[PDB]
Backbone as a ProteinNet text record, in pm:
[ID]
protein_1_A
[PRIMARY]
XXXXXXXXXXXXXXXXXXXXXXXXXXXX
[TERTIARY]
9958	9886	9789.2	9844.9	9768.2	9838.3	9769.8	9826.4	9770.7	9857.7	9816.6	9738.3	9787.1	9723.1	9588.8	9581.7	9458.1	9353.4	9396.9	9310.7	9268.6	9359.8	9330.3	9214.4	9222.1	9116.3	8984.4	8990.3	8872.3	8821.3	8912.4	8875.6	8820.2	8857.4	8807.7	8659.8	8630.3	8493.4	8412.4	8475.8	8408.9	8482.3	8432	8487.9	8458.5	8523.2	8499.1	8604	8560.4	8648.7	8762.1	8727	8826.4	8923.6	8870.8	8953.4	9053.6	9003.7	9088.6	9198.8	9158.6	9251.5	9358.7	9317.7	9409.8	9489.5	9442.3	9519.2	9636.7	9606.1	9707.1	9824	9791.3	9890.6	9897.7	9867.5	9882.8	10027.3	10117.4	10259.8	10303.4	10311.7	10345.9	10432
10070.8	9966	9892.7	9805.9	9726.9	9593.5	9501.8	9371.2	9324.1	9313.7	9283.3	9152.2	9049.1	8918	8920.2	8996.4	9010.5	9082.8	9188.2	9262.1	9171.6	9083.2	8983.9	8896.4	8850.6	8769.6	8846.9	8973.1	9059.6	9083.1	9084.8	9107.2	8978.4	8865.3	8735.4	8723.3	8747.7	8743.1	8861.9	8979	9101.2	9162.6	9140.7	9203.3	9354	9427.1	9570.3	9653.1	9765.5	9854	9907.7	9983.8	10048.8	9947.1	9831.9	9723.6	9677.8	9652	9610.6	9713.5	9839.5	9946.4	9964.1	9953.8	9968.8	9840.7	9729.9	9605.7	9620.8	9663	9679	9764.9	9866.3	9960.4	9954.5	9837.2	9812.9	9838.1	9785.9	9808.2	9915.2	10038.6	10152.1	10251.5
9553.1	9628.7	9536.8	9453.5	9358.4	9334.5	9267.5	9235	9101.4	9002	8865.2	8857.1	8925.1	8920.5	8993.1	9101.6	9177.9	9093.5	9025.2	8933.4	8817.7	8776.4	8673.1	8717.4	8841.8	8901.3	8900.3	8942.3	8942.2	8800.2	8703.3	8563.7	8502.6	8562.3	8521.7	8558	8685.3	8735.8	8683.6	8676.9	8631.9	8512.7	8389.7	8269	8265.8	8356	8372.9	8298.3	8241.2	8164.7	8251.1	8354.8	8440.3	8498.5	8538.6	8591.2	8485.4	8364.7	8253.1	8227.9	8213	8176.9	8284.1	8410	8522.1	8545	8488.2	8487.4	8391.4	8268.7	8163.9	8213.1	8292.4	8343.3	8496	8551.9	8695.6	8736.8	8655.2	8669.8	8570.2	8617.7	8533.5	8611.1
[MASK]
++++++++++++++++++++++++++++

């Protein structure tokens, strides 16, 4: 239950570590 592009948006507004890391492997 995740969305890479949505997390991208969240990573855009919030340059967060966990968000970034879970973005990279959102699709895993």
